[PDB]
Short mmCIF file of all heavy atoms in Angstrom, two decimals:
data_model
loop_
_atom_site.label_atom_id
_atom_site.label_comp_id
_atom_site.label_asym_id
_atom_site.label_seq_id
_atom_site.Cartn_x
_atom_site.Cartn_y
_atom_site.Cartn_z
N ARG A 1 2.56 0.14 10.23
CA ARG A 1 3.70 0.81 9.64
C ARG A 1 4.30 -0.04 8.53
O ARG A 1 4.56 -1.23 8.72
CB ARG A 1 4.74 1.12 10.71
CG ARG A 1 4.39 2.35 11.52
CD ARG A 1 5.03 2.35 12.89
NE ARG A 1 4.18 3.12 13.81
CZ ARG A 1 4.22 4.44 13.97
NH1 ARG A 1 5.10 5.19 13.29
NH2 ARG A 1 3.39 5.02 14.82
N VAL A 2 4.50 0.58 7.37
CA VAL A 2 5.12 -0.08 6.22
C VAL A 2 6.40 0.68 5.82
O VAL A 2 6.36 1.85 5.42
CB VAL A 2 4.15 -0.19 5.00
CG1 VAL A 2 4.83 -0.93 3.83
CG2 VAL A 2 2.85 -0.89 5.39
N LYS A 3 7.53 -0.01 5.96
CA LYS A 3 8.82 0.49 5.47
C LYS A 3 8.90 0.33 3.95
O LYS A 3 8.58 -0.71 3.39
CB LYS A 3 9.97 -0.24 6.19
CG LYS A 3 9.99 0.04 7.71
CD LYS A 3 11.09 -0.72 8.43
CE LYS A 3 11.08 -0.42 9.93
NZ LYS A 3 9.73 -0.65 10.52
N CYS A 4 9.30 1.41 3.27
CA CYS A 4 9.30 1.44 1.82
C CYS A 4 10.25 2.53 1.30
O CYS A 4 11.02 3.11 2.07
CB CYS A 4 7.88 1.66 1.29
SG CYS A 4 7.10 3.16 1.92
N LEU A 5 10.17 2.80 -0.01
CA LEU A 5 10.99 3.82 -0.66
C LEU A 5 10.08 4.85 -1.32
O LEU A 5 9.01 4.51 -1.85
CB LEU A 5 11.90 3.19 -1.73
CG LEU A 5 12.91 2.09 -1.34
CD1 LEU A 5 13.71 1.61 -2.54
CD2 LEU A 5 13.85 2.55 -0.24
N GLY A 6 10.50 6.11 -1.28
CA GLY A 6 9.71 7.18 -1.89
C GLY A 6 9.42 6.92 -3.36
O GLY A 6 8.37 7.30 -3.85
N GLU A 7 10.35 6.25 -4.04
CA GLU A 7 10.25 5.95 -5.48
C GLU A 7 9.25 4.84 -5.83
O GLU A 7 8.91 4.68 -7.01
CB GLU A 7 11.64 5.60 -6.06
CG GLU A 7 12.12 4.19 -5.70
CD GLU A 7 13.47 3.83 -6.31
OE1 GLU A 7 13.73 4.19 -7.48
OE2 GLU A 7 14.28 3.20 -5.62
N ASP A 8 8.82 4.07 -4.83
CA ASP A 8 7.83 3.00 -5.02
C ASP A 8 6.53 3.56 -5.55
O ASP A 8 6.09 4.62 -5.10
CB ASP A 8 7.50 2.32 -3.69
CG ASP A 8 8.63 1.50 -3.13
OD1 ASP A 8 9.63 1.22 -3.84
OD2 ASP A 8 8.50 1.11 -1.96
N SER A 9 5.90 2.85 -6.48
CA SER A 9 4.55 3.22 -6.90
C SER A 9 3.58 2.88 -5.76
O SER A 9 3.86 2.00 -4.95
CB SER A 9 4.15 2.47 -8.17
OG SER A 9 4.12 1.07 -7.94
N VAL A 10 2.45 3.58 -5.71
CA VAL A 10 1.35 3.19 -4.83
C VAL A 10 0.99 1.71 -5.02
O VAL A 10 0.69 1.01 -4.05
CB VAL A 10 0.11 4.11 -5.04
CG1 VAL A 10 -1.12 3.60 -4.28
CG2 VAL A 10 0.45 5.54 -4.60
N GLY A 11 1.06 1.24 -6.26
CA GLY A 11 0.79 -0.16 -6.59
C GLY A 11 1.76 -1.09 -5.88
O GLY A 11 1.35 -2.07 -5.26
N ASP A 12 3.05 -0.79 -5.96
CA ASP A 12 4.05 -1.61 -5.29
C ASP A 12 3.98 -1.43 -3.78
O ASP A 12 4.24 -2.37 -3.04
CB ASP A 12 5.44 -1.29 -5.83
CG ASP A 12 5.66 -1.85 -7.23
OD1 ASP A 12 4.85 -2.69 -7.69
OD2 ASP A 12 6.66 -1.47 -7.86
N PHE A 13 3.61 -0.24 -3.32
CA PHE A 13 3.32 -0.06 -1.88
C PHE A 13 2.19 -0.98 -1.39
O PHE A 13 2.30 -1.61 -0.32
CB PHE A 13 3.00 1.40 -1.55
CG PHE A 13 2.72 1.64 -0.08
CD1 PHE A 13 3.77 1.79 0.82
CD2 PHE A 13 1.41 1.71 0.39
CE1 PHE A 13 3.52 2.01 2.18
CE2 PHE A 13 1.14 1.92 1.76
CZ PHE A 13 2.20 2.06 2.65
N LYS A 14 1.10 -1.02 -2.15
CA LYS A 14 -0.05 -1.85 -1.81
C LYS A 14 0.30 -3.34 -1.74
O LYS A 14 -0.25 -4.08 -0.92
CB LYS A 14 -1.19 -1.64 -2.82
CG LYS A 14 -2.00 -0.34 -2.60
CD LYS A 14 -3.14 -0.24 -3.62
CE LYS A 14 -3.91 1.08 -3.48
NZ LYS A 14 -4.91 1.26 -4.61
N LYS A 15 1.22 -3.77 -2.60
CA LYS A 15 1.67 -5.17 -2.61
C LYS A 15 2.29 -5.56 -1.27
O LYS A 15 1.95 -6.60 -0.71
CB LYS A 15 2.66 -5.42 -3.75
CG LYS A 15 2.01 -5.45 -5.12
CD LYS A 15 3.04 -5.67 -6.21
CE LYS A 15 2.38 -6.03 -7.52
NZ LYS A 15 3.42 -6.39 -8.51
N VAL A 16 3.15 -4.70 -0.73
CA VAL A 16 3.83 -4.99 0.53
C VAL A 16 2.85 -4.81 1.69
O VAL A 16 2.80 -5.64 2.62
CB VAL A 16 5.12 -4.11 0.73
CG1 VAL A 16 5.74 -4.32 2.10
CG2 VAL A 16 6.15 -4.42 -0.34
N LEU A 17 2.06 -3.73 1.64
CA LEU A 17 1.01 -3.50 2.64
C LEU A 17 0.11 -4.74 2.80
O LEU A 17 -0.15 -5.17 3.93
CB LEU A 17 0.16 -2.27 2.29
CG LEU A 17 -1.09 -2.02 3.17
CD1 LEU A 17 -0.69 -1.82 4.63
CD2 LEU A 17 -1.88 -0.82 2.66
N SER A 18 -0.32 -5.31 1.68
CA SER A 18 -1.27 -6.43 1.64
C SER A 18 -0.71 -7.69 2.29
O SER A 18 -1.45 -8.44 2.93
CB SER A 18 -1.66 -6.74 0.19
OG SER A 18 -2.35 -5.64 -0.39
N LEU A 19 0.59 -7.91 2.11
CA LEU A 19 1.27 -9.03 2.74
C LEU A 19 1.38 -8.83 4.26
O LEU A 19 1.31 -9.80 5.02
CB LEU A 19 2.65 -9.24 2.11
CG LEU A 19 2.62 -9.81 0.69
CD1 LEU A 19 3.90 -9.48 -0.07
CD2 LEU A 19 2.35 -11.32 0.71
N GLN A 20 1.53 -7.58 4.69
CA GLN A 20 1.57 -7.28 6.12
C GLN A 20 0.19 -7.37 6.82
O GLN A 20 0.13 -7.67 8.01
CB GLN A 20 2.21 -5.91 6.38
CG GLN A 20 3.76 -5.87 6.26
CD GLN A 20 4.34 -4.48 6.57
OE1 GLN A 20 5.09 -3.91 5.78
NE2 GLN A 20 3.95 -3.91 7.71
N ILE A 21 -0.90 -7.13 6.08
CA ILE A 21 -2.23 -7.04 6.71
C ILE A 21 -3.21 -8.14 6.30
O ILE A 21 -4.33 -8.20 6.80
CB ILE A 21 -2.86 -5.61 6.55
CG1 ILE A 21 -3.32 -5.37 5.10
CG2 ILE A 21 -1.86 -4.55 7.00
CD1 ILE A 21 -4.03 -4.05 4.89
N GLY A 22 -2.77 -9.01 5.39
CA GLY A 22 -3.53 -10.21 5.03
C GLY A 22 -4.67 -9.95 4.08
O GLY A 22 -5.78 -10.44 4.30
N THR A 23 -4.39 -9.19 3.02
CA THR A 23 -5.38 -8.92 1.96
C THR A 23 -4.69 -8.97 0.59
O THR A 23 -3.53 -9.40 0.49
CB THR A 23 -6.13 -7.55 2.20
OG1 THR A 23 -7.19 -7.39 1.24
CG2 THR A 23 -5.18 -6.35 2.12
N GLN A 24 -5.42 -8.58 -0.45
CA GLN A 24 -4.87 -8.43 -1.81
C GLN A 24 -4.99 -6.96 -2.22
O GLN A 24 -5.96 -6.30 -1.83
CB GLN A 24 -5.68 -9.27 -2.80
CG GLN A 24 -6.02 -10.65 -2.26
N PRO A 25 -4.03 -6.45 -3.03
CA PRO A 25 -4.11 -5.06 -3.52
C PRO A 25 -5.46 -4.66 -4.13
O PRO A 25 -5.91 -3.54 -3.89
CB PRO A 25 -2.98 -4.99 -4.55
CG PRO A 25 -1.97 -5.96 -4.03
CD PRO A 25 -2.79 -7.11 -3.50
N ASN A 26 -6.09 -5.55 -4.90
CA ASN A 26 -7.39 -5.24 -5.50
C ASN A 26 -8.57 -5.13 -4.51
O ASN A 26 -9.68 -4.80 -4.91
CB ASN A 26 -7.72 -6.18 -6.69
CG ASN A 26 -8.00 -7.64 -6.27
OD1 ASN A 26 -8.05 -8.53 -7.13
ND2 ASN A 26 -8.19 -7.88 -4.99
N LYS A 27 -8.32 -5.39 -3.23
CA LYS A 27 -9.38 -5.30 -2.22
C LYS A 27 -9.38 -3.97 -1.49
O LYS A 27 -10.29 -3.67 -0.70
CB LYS A 27 -9.27 -6.44 -1.19
CG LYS A 27 -9.25 -7.86 -1.75
CD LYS A 27 -10.50 -8.21 -2.57
CE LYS A 27 -10.64 -9.72 -2.78
NZ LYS A 27 -9.49 -10.34 -3.52
N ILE A 28 -8.35 -3.16 -1.74
CA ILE A 28 -8.09 -1.97 -0.92
C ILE A 28 -7.88 -0.67 -1.70
O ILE A 28 -7.45 -0.66 -2.86
CB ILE A 28 -6.90 -2.19 0.06
CG1 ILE A 28 -5.61 -2.51 -0.71
CG2 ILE A 28 -7.23 -3.29 1.09
CD1 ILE A 28 -4.35 -2.39 0.14
N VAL A 29 -8.23 0.43 -1.02
CA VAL A 29 -8.10 1.79 -1.50
C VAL A 29 -7.30 2.57 -0.44
O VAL A 29 -7.55 2.40 0.76
CB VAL A 29 -9.49 2.46 -1.67
CG1 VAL A 29 -9.37 3.95 -1.98
CG2 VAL A 29 -10.32 1.76 -2.75
N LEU A 30 -6.35 3.39 -0.88
CA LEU A 30 -5.61 4.27 0.02
C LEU A 30 -5.89 5.72 -0.30
O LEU A 30 -6.03 6.10 -1.47
CB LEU A 30 -4.11 4.02 -0.04
CG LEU A 30 -3.61 2.71 0.57
CD1 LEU A 30 -2.17 2.48 0.15
CD2 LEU A 30 -3.73 2.75 2.10
N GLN A 31 -5.97 6.53 0.75
CA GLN A 31 -6.17 7.96 0.61
C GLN A 31 -5.15 8.71 1.45
O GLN A 31 -4.77 8.26 2.54
CB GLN A 31 -7.55 8.39 1.10
CG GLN A 31 -8.74 7.82 0.36
CD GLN A 31 -10.02 8.52 0.80
OE1 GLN A 31 -10.01 9.36 1.70
NE2 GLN A 31 -11.11 8.18 0.16
N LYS A 32 -4.70 9.84 0.93
CA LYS A 32 -3.93 10.80 1.70
C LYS A 32 -4.75 12.08 1.81
O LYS A 32 -5.06 12.72 0.81
CB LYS A 32 -2.59 11.10 1.04
CG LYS A 32 -1.70 12.03 1.84
CD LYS A 32 -0.38 12.28 1.12
CE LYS A 32 0.47 13.29 1.86
NZ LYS A 32 -0.06 14.68 1.75
N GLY A 33 -5.09 12.44 3.05
CA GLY A 33 -5.84 13.65 3.34
C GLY A 33 -6.93 13.96 2.34
O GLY A 33 -6.88 14.99 1.66
N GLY A 34 -7.88 13.05 2.22
CA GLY A 34 -9.06 13.28 1.39
C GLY A 34 -9.04 12.64 0.02
O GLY A 34 -10.07 12.20 -0.47
N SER A 35 -7.86 12.59 -0.61
CA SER A 35 -7.78 12.09 -1.98
C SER A 35 -7.20 10.69 -2.14
O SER A 35 -6.26 10.29 -1.45
CB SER A 35 -7.09 13.09 -2.93
OG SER A 35 -6.11 13.87 -2.27
N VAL A 36 -7.80 9.96 -3.07
CA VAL A 36 -7.42 8.60 -3.39
C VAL A 36 -6.10 8.58 -4.15
O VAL A 36 -5.88 9.38 -5.07
CB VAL A 36 -8.53 7.92 -4.23
CG1 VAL A 36 -8.13 6.50 -4.61
CG2 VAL A 36 -9.85 7.92 -3.47
#
C-alpha cells in the first residue's frame, strides 16, 4: 500500500513506491487493468 495524492504523476508515484519496495523507478512498470 502506497499513500499518495490523486494529483501525483505516475512518475512521482513510482518514486515513493520504489523507496517502499527497494527498487528504482526505471526498473519497474505499472499497469491498471491491462494498460500501462
Side-chain angles (χ1 to χ4, degrees), residues 1-23 25-36:
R1 281 156 208 275
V2 182
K3 297 178 180 53
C4 57
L5 302 180
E7 76 178 320
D8 290 347
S9 62
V10 172
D12 286 347
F13 181 81
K14 282 182 184 172
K15 287 179 166 186
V16 174
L17 173 61
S18 297
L19 289 157
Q20 283 181 233
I21 73 176
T23 187
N26 69 192
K27 305 301 196 299
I28 60 165
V29 172
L30 289 167
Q31 297 190 356
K32 184 180 176 287
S35 31
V36 178

